[PDB]
Amino acid sequence: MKTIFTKKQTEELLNDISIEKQKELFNSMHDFRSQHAKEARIPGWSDKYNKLEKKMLSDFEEVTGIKYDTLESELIWDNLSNKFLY
Ligand SMILES: [Zn+2]
């Protein structure tokens, strides 16, 4: 679904935020997404999962200044994962 910012706006933001801050956000997204993959198809959400989720949300807001939402986060993830290698 359409995101709160355009695709072009999101690209241009990621041409402005520093590479080190982008990498920070990539790593916290990567850690969350990996844990989500382990728990996606089974009951419950572990305390570890919740901890990683909360970290990701906090880093998202710190690095981007954008109120967290799942769709704009996805669009940012796709851009970050294209650039960075865990
Ligand atoms: Zn689950």
Author numbering: 1 to 86
How did the manuscript describe this experimental structure?
AcrIIA28 is classified as an anti-CRISPR protein renowned for its capacity to impede the DNA cleavage activity inherent to the Cas9 enzyme. Our current study reveals that AcrIIA28 is a metalloprotein that contains Zn2+ and abolishes the cleavage activity of Cas9 only from Streptococcus pyrogen (SpyCas9) by directly interacting with the REC3 domain of SpyCas9. Furthermore, we demonstrate that the AcrIIA28 interaction prevents the target DNA from being loaded onto Cas9.
Finally, the 1.45 Å high-resolution structure of AcrIIA28 was determined, and the final structural model was refined to Rwork = 19.75% and Rfree= 20.36%. The crystal belonged to space group P41212 and contained a single molecule in the asymmetric unit (ASU). Two major long helices in the centre (α2 and α3) is covered by two short helices from N- and C-terminal parts (α1 and α4). B-factor analysis highlighted high rigidity, with low B-factor values (average 25.3 Å) for most of the structure, except the α3 region (average 48.2 Å), underscoring the rigid conformation of the AcrIIA28 protein in solution. In addition, the other selected proteins also exhibited low Z-scores (around 5.9–5.6) and sequence identity (2–12%), indicating that the AcrIIA28 structure is novel, whose fold has not been reported previously. This metal ion density was coordinated by oxygens from the main chain of E39, I42 and G44.
